[PDB]
Design a protein around this nucleic acid. Structure first.
Ligand SMILES: N#C[C@]1(COP(=O)(O)OP(=O)(O)OP(=O)(O)O)/C(=C\F)[C@@H](n2cnc3c(=O)[nH]c(N)nc32)C[C@@H]1O
Ligand SMILES: [Mg+2]
Lengths: 406, 553
DNA sequence: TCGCCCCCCTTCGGTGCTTTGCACCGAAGGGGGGC
């Protein structure tokens, strides 16, 4: 087959990211995986004259107890030419986020049948480490379209369209969306019925080469004001400061007469009664915060941003936006392991869940602002990652000015 | 000999040409020395004479070798290195003896003239040109180029390492039950074979290396313990570091203290309890490597402690994969931590220390978490797994920390060990305001252009105070205002500020800070019985906040 | 008068914040050690 000519964006060089340490289990898995792919010509052993590198690690699901190799091509994807500019990219269907159930299938293996522009392969180098540095690193570069590279779905585009062509007309009410190495496929059947059609697709795919999502249970959680009969100065101070922040989001919110109530240098535990003029103010502000904000629409040409806050006892609130204070979506994630002991595992799971919802809804992941120290996140996150994609993220230390979302 | 291994193709950076640099110490002794070295190298085909059509040049020199009676040759390729292409280095770390498993039979060998046994790519040789002068400049001079990896070139280590890996891989695949540690030209070979058979595999390995052009001189062939390896001594049951000699001076310069700290850090991998914080302090605010620095009293005590630690003999043991790894941390004070990693009690695999201050404001629980993360990473590098931890922090303390701290945090499976001083939270902010406690509405403002500010408060019981501040910032004024409330209040206090900044610092329960102002606030928070710290938005006429707002003008 | 790697401690300068200094972070200086 002919290679598609691919290029890095003007004035950019390939990734030069160091490999991080990996456990024994993952090194062994990466070597058995890479030894075979070398044998099948999918990758070639290289040396140090290739100046590029990208971290590699491995993930194992508990519904799929085999190791899956994962190359963190985030830096390479950033520096790769856009394929929307070349009109090879994938359009997102607005229909998926409505469906009863959405299953995710890893079709990254399909990319291994199409060669990569030989002049671009050097940018795909990665290095397997060794326990106790018994040996130098062993380096490989791809010869095929790599899993995790954003150009692979774009180049395989018109091929995937042919593979799914029959399944699509035979099932016109199922919607398929390809994102990276994944197929997001949703329908409105009974779970049993739906699953069945999935195995059909699987076996059709299998001829050539996790768990059910449910979009309609992704309830938005809004900004709710407490309900009390007696209000202390402090209770009102928190309420005023909470509605004051919200005035940057919502419109026509007032503190004129709740702020009046704090008149004087009062003790924080003193119970101030509530005027009609201020009781009107609150119940007015309550409704404004009940049903969502008018004037916020998705822009596909801007980045998606996600902010997460730890609320304790297993709860995590999150907001997705493009312009600050114009949230496309607010939510609240909740844990699942039966011990409620591990914050980093919960945050890692929350990030995958939020990112999955963005793919389902908008077709791309957000850039995460993670409420965690960089070095704590990097010490543990790979142990809980289960997705074939990895979103962008940055690390924030923002104390809760108010418990806005709780 | 020169390996028949295929060359590694190398390039210069795009747009750049080769070096062109003239020659130094044109002495006669040196010239004759240089023609003597080069003629033997030339006879073995390591270098070749070149003429004036090659425009490039680089200068030459040579230093001594640790193995006495050998000189080492070096060419100053600083310029060529700048123009040579980048390499991805495949040496990802340093093997450690604690990662070794006990072996029945062990051998340590080394390759002779390692770099000079690897050919250099044909097209790149002309850039390694160096002229040898002529009689202190009388005539044009003798030129050579390298045909092999030169010492001093940026690409030589990586290209050798890669070449050695290719050469050993046939032997590795064939003998998986032979552990080979490959560090540059140094090979450690361990096995559970009986000595007679082990030796068969050795000369089988040596003969394989020689087919590919790698000699293994008897001189560097270690057949008997103790083995000298990577700066350690390998015994059958244990390992030592080669002796570490610290400088002893009457008058210390900055540079000697730098040397001292470096030795102590190297020693801390097996010598438990090493501290360098007071010795490193001396290095701060200094401005010359030759600057004489008088040791503080604290630095003398720390060195004395370290010297007594180093006087006693210690050894590490080897790794048993059938037993768990255990990591025990102790707190040493002033942000210093020391740890031991072991599998059976009182038999350390290695030790170490953590003493970095991350952030301007932190506490012992955060630093403990960072120590655990450092140890966790080290254990992955050496043993491929993390250890079980024994930590001097109570479960109540940790659980209080991660329920009241807003950032996700975590520590693996750990077991409380009672080795005082324990790691504790030194104060906890009340989640709710305190009945009966005085309420302080604090605020402080500084004029960005002026340098002048005020800090003060107004209270529900009727007290007021303003302090003028000079040479301050706006964030300082707000910390100063909280400082006054804590100073003039009783054991229980409610405080209202409009500084998200100050609230952010304090709500993280720091117990140490680079700021002396924050340090003072911490000392006060620890003396208090109950503190509630609430925030409000400024300039929105809140009762109290507006009162003190108006006053601090 | 040289090369490559890991570690620690200090300093410096770039980044972003609904900032005006501040906190964070990575790179570079010194030292240790390896070959
Ligand atoms: N490979 C290899 C060797 C082995 O160095 P090593 O002590 O083992 O000696 P050797 O192999 O040259 O020969 P020998 O073993 O004595 O018979 C090296 C590292 F491992 C390289 N190298 C060592 N030190 C230095 C050094 O300071 N400056 C530079 N620029 N390069 C060095 C060159 C040498 O080739
Ligand atoms: Mg040698």
């Amino acid at each position: 087959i002919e290679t598609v000519p691919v290029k890095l964006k003007p004035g950019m060089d390939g990734p030069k990211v160091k490999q991080w340490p990996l456990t024994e289990e993952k090194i062994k898995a990466l070597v058995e995986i890479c030894t075979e792919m070398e044998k099948e010509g999918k990758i070639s052993k290289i040396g140090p004259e290739n100046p590029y590198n990208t971290p590699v690690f491995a993930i194992k699901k508990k519904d799929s107890t085999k190791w899956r190799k994962l190359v963190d091509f985030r830096e390479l994807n950033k520096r790769t030419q856009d394929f929307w500019e070349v009109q090879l990219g994938i359009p997102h269907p607005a229909g998926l986020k409505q469906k009863k159930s959405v299953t995710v299938l890893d079709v990254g293996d399909a990319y291994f049948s199409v060669p990569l522009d030989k002049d671009f392969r050097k940018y795909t180098a990665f290095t397997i480490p060794s326990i106790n540095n018994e040996t130098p690193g062993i380096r490989y570069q791809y010869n095929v379209l790599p899993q995790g590279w954003k150009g692979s779905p774009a180049i395989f585009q018109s091929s995937m369209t042919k593979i799914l062509e029959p399944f699509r007309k035979q099932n016109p009410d199922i919607v398929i969306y390809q994102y990276m190495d994944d197929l997001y496929v949703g329908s409105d059947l009974e779970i049993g019925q739906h699953r069945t059609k999935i195995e059909e697709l699987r076996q059709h795919l299998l001829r050539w080469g996790g768990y059910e999502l449910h979009p309609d249970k992704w309830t938005v959680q809004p900004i709710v004001l407490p309900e009390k009969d007696s209000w202390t100065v402090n209770d009102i101070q928190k309420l005023v400061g909470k509605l004051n922040w919200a005035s940057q989001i919502y419109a026509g919110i007032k503190v004129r007469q709740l702020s009046k109530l704090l008149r004087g240098t009062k003790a924080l535990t003193e119970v101030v009664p509530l005027t009609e003029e201020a009781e009107l103010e609150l119940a007015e502000n309550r409704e404004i915060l009940k049903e969502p904000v008018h004037g916020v629409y998705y822009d596909p040409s801007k980045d998606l941003i996600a902010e997460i806050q730890k609320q304790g006892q297993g709860q995590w609130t999150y907001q997705i936006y493009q312009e600050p204070f114009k949230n496309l979506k607010t939510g609240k994630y909740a844990r699942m392991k039966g011990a409620h002991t591990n914050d980093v595992k919960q945050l890692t799971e929350a990030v995958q869940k939020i990112a999955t919802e963005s793919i389902v809804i908008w077709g791309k992941t957000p850039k995460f602002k993670l409420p965690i120290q960089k070095e704590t996140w990097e010490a543990w996150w790979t142990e809980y990652w289960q997705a074939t994609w990895i979103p962008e993220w940055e690390f924030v230390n923002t104390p809760p000015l108010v418990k806005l979302w709780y | 000999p020169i390996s028949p291994i295929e060359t590694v193709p190398v390039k210069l950076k795009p747009g750049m040409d080769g070096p062109k640099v003239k020659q130094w110490p044109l002495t006669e002794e040196k010239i004759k020395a240089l023609v003597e070295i080069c003629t033997e190298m030339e006879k073995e085909g390591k270098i070749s004479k070149i003429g004036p059509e090659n425009p490039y040049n680089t200068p030459v020199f040579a230093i001594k070798k640790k193995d006495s009676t050998k000189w080492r040759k070096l060419v100053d390729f600083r310029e060529l290195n700048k123009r040579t292409q980048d390499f991805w280095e495949v040496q990802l770390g340093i093997p450690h003896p604690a990662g070794l498993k006990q072996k029945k039979s062990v051998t340590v060998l080394d390759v002779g003239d390692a770099f000079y046994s690897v050919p250099l790519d044909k097209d790149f040789r002309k850039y390694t040109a160096f002229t040898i002068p002529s009689i202190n400049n009388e005539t044009p001079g003798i030129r050579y180029q390298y045909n092999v990896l030169p010492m001093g070139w940026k690409g030589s280590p990586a290209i050798f390492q890669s070449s050695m890996t290719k050469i050993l891989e046939p032997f590795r695949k064939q003998n998986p039950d032979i552990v080979i540690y490959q560090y540059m030209d140094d090979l450690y070979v361990g096995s559970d074979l009986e000595i007679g058979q082990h030796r068969t595999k050795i000369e089988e390995l040596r003969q394989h290396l020689l087919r590919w052009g790698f000699t293994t001189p008897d001189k560097k062939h270690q057949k008997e313990p103790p083995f000298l390896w990577m700066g350690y001594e390998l015994h059958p049951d244990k390992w030592t570091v080669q002796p570490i000699v610290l400088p002893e001076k009457d008058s210390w310069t900055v540079n000697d203290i730098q040397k001292l700290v470096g030795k102590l850090n190297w020693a801390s991998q097996i010598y438990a309890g090493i501290k360098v914080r007071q010795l490193s302090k001396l290095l701060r605010g200094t401005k010359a490597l030759t600057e004489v620095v008088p040791l503080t009293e604290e630095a003398e005590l720390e060195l004395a402690e370290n010297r007594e630690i180093l006087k006693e003999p210690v050894h590490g043991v080897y790794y048993d994969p059938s037993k768990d790894l255990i990591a025990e941390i102790q707190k040493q004070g002033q942000g210093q931590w020391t740890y031991q990693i072991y599998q059976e009690p009182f038999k350390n695999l290695k030790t170490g220390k953590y003493a970095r201050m991350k952030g301007a404001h932190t506490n012992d629980v955060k630093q403990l978490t960072e120590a655990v993360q450092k140890i966790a990473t080290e254990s992955i590098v050496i043993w491929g797994k993390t250890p079980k931890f024994k930590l001097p922090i109570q479960k109540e303390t940790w659980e209080a920390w991660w329920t009241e701290y807003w950032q996700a945090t975590w520590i693996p499976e750990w077991e409380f060990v009672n080795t005082p001083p324990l790691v504790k939270l030194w104060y906890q902010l009340e989640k709710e305001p305190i009945i009966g406690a005085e309420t302080f509405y604090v605020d402080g403002a500084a004029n960005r252009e002026t340098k002048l500010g005020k800090a003060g408060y107004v209270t529900d019981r009727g007290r007021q105070k303003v302090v003028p501040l000079t040479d301050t910032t706006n964030q300082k004024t707000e910390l100063q205002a909280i400082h006054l409330a804590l100073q003039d209040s009783g054991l229980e206090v409610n405080i209202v500020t409009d500084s998200q900044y100050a609230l952010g610092i304090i709500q993280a329960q720091p117990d140490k800070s680079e700021s002396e102002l924050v340090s003072q606030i911490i000392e006060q928070l620890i003396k208090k019985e109950k503190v509630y710290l609430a925030w409000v938005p400024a300039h929105k006429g809140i009762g109290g906040n507006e009162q003190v707002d108006k006053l601090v003008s």
